[PDB]
Ligand binder design. Structure first.
Ligand code: UPG
Length: 607
């Protein structure tokens, strides 16, 4: 969402408050971003904007479907893109072309020129301030010649843009998890050693047969390499543990009962947190076995000392002719996460590159000081999130956690804890939310009636729902919600109790899932790991995919792609995140999909 406001303020006639303002109302119809990839909403939105914000917000209201817009019938940047016959527009453009030729491997293409041109324009608009900048904006919009010494203010700017795309990132820009990403790939890895984790929520069945069949194949295919499986004795019955222990012995699987591990330092903090989840899972008090696996992943005694890849228990592999024959590979970092990128079109510019991180495959090198640094860096992040639950939720950039902070049920929960001198733990939060969503009244009481009003499509009935809530008029809540579900309340007068009740159970389950997911993933999972990696990213200008850079290792995304991820370093094949530089439409794998640790699928994993 970073890039939205820029466009609005640079092409859509917004300013600060209406630029934000728009988005706060532009999303009430997620995914603003289709609109922005064409500039046709922004052209129209600027025409309306010219007659005030109300004129624009009224047009988005009465509009049938957005992105369905077709033309009708001191903004130095933006003025620079409107009408480049102006002498200075022409001079930056030529420089862009020169820049491209000294930075690329082939004949620069339109979008590649547009990218470097807008880079010049925004830089020149940042180098100018005051009246002379007002002058320049007037000069470009009255198309007269380049002022004296404009080509000397422009040289340091051009040399910076050029240097940024030709000089290899220095080691300060390649610090990943406290370890420099080195371009000579000194760290060695195994394509055969692997471990996975499985904590069963069913004491009579240690692991599903389908997953068991997968590890049998993994252990068979990975020749004499280790195929380790981490589990918990305390989650099984004696009978089932003995069954499990023999199945692994019979299939060349190295079992590791993490309950017997004696740990020090962060290892012990992760171990205790993990046992706490499992104990809460066992006691039906909000624990999650995937959260357990997220933390156990990073325990040094669990990983082991020889190079080894973590993989999700159900991960498949390219065994066959087109696998990797060599047992050893190399990369530039001790801990390799799974990575990829999605390309977002940006009209006449180059598409933005959005990197994705995942922990479904983590390739570890052998024991060494560096791998220990990067591991400790992750374990500390995850342990911190568990120690400061409310603080992380409060600061979270996740949409569902922001809304959780505004919920009155959440505030009540906190009040209980602080008044009861208890700290809000993750399992407690998860448990509370689950109970809250077990019925519509508790649900509506937890989220504000305001919240319930906007979601159900009638913000003005918020006071009404409050009264129906206060006096047990739970009929209006049912119909208000069902009415928003099945379009209109004429149709809800054709449902009886049974069919209406089943509709509200589905809805409530879906709402609970939206919060649950991030209450595992943002604390111990891949989103929590992602948050620890983001500082390594620029934060200034977006990352565009440059295709023929003479020195590709000047862009941080190309350094990760080549030197610090598992791509091309394992036989395991994951589709949980896109491959590198995957097209936006190609990421439509998402259309053809509840995971095994979400409350529904975990409900059934035992029952
Ligand atoms: O009953 C269970 C269910 C899950 N798991 C663990 O959770 C992992 C992921 O299960 P999966 O069903 O594949 O869910 P995903 O959504 O694919 O999981 C993502 O989200 C999880 C929680 O953040 C992470 O731990 C995973 O690595 C990440 O791939 C498994 O491999 C196990 O290690 C258990 O241990 N017991």
């Amino acid at each position: 969402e970073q890039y939205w406001r820029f466009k609005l303020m640079t092409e859509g006639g917004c300013n600060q408050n209406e630029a934000t303002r728009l988005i706060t109302v532009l999303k009430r119809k997620e995914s603003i971003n289709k609109l922005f990839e064409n500039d046709n909403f922004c052209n129209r939105l600027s025409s309306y904007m010219a007659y005030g914000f109300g004129a624009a917000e009224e047009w988005i209201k009465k509009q049938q479907i957005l992105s369905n817009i077709q033309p009708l019938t001191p903004n130095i940047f933006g003025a620079a893109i409107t009408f480049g016959k102006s002498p200075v527009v022409k001079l930056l453009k030529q420089n862009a072309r020169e820049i491209c030729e000294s930075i690329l491997m082939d004949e620069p293409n339109l979008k590649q020129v547009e990218y470097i041109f807008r880079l010049l324009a925004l830089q020149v608009q940042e180098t100018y301030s005051g009246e002379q900048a007002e002058k320049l904006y007037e000069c470009i919009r009255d198309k007269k010649p380049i002022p004296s010494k404009f080509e000397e203010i422009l040289l340091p700017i051009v040399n910076r843009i050029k240097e940024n795309h030709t000089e290899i990132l220095n080691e300060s820009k390649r610090n990943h998890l406290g370890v420099t990403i080195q371009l000579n790939d000194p760290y060695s890895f195994s394509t055969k050693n692997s471990f996975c984790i499985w904590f069963s929520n069913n004491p009579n069945s240690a692991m599903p047969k389908k997953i068991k069949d997968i590890l049998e194949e993994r252990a068979k295919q990975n020749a004499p390499g280790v195929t380790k499986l981490v589990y918990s004795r305390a989650c099984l019955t004696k009978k089932e543990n003995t069954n499990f222990v023999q199945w692994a012995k019979e299939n060349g699987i190295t079992l590791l009962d993490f309950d017997e591990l004696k740990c020090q330092g962060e290892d012990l903090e992760l171990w205790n947190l993990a046992q706490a989840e499992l104990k809460a899972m066992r006691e039906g008090k909000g624990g999650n076995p995937a959260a357990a696996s997220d933390l156990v992943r990073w325990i040094s005694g669990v990983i082991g000392d020889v190079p080894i890849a973590y993989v999700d228990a159900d991960m498949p592999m390219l065994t066959g002719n087109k696998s990797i024959k060599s047992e050893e590979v190399y990369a530039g970092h001790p801990v390799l996460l799974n990575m990829g990128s999605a390309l977002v079109k940006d009209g006449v510019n180059l598409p933005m590159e959005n990197v994705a991180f995942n922990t479904d495959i983590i390739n570890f090198t052998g024991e060494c000081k560096d791998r220990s640094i990067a591991i400790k860096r992750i374990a500390q992040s995850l342990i911190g999130n568990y120690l400061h639950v409310t603080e992380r939720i409060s600061k979270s950039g996740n949409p569902e956690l922001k809304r959780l902070g505004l919920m009155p049920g959440y505030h009540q929960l906190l009040k209980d804890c602080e008044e009861n001198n208890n700290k809000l733990s993750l399992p407690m939060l998860r448990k509370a939310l689950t109970q809250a969503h077990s019925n519509l009244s508790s649900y509506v009481r937890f989220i504000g009636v305001q919240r319930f009003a906007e979601m159900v499509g009638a913000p003005e009935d918020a006071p009404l729902f409050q009264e129906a809530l206060q006096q047990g008029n739970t009929i209006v809540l049912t119909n208000a919600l069902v009415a928003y579900l099945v379009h209109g309340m004429d149709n809800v007068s054709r449902l009886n109790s049974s069919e209406k009740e089943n509709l509200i159970k589905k809805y409530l389950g879906t709402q609970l899932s939206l919060l649950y997911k991030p209450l595992v993933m943002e604390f111990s999972g891949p989103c929590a790991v992602t948050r620890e990696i983001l500082p390594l990213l620029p934060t200034g200008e977006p990352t565009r995919y440059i295709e023929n850079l003479k020195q590709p290792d000047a862009q941080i995304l190309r350094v990760l792609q080549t030197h610090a991820c598992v791509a091309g370093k394992t036989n395991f094949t994951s589709d949980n995140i896109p491959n590198w530089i995957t097209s936006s439409e190609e990421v439509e794998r998402t259309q053809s999909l509840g995971l095994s640790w979400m409350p529904s699928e975990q409900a059934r994993l035992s029952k």
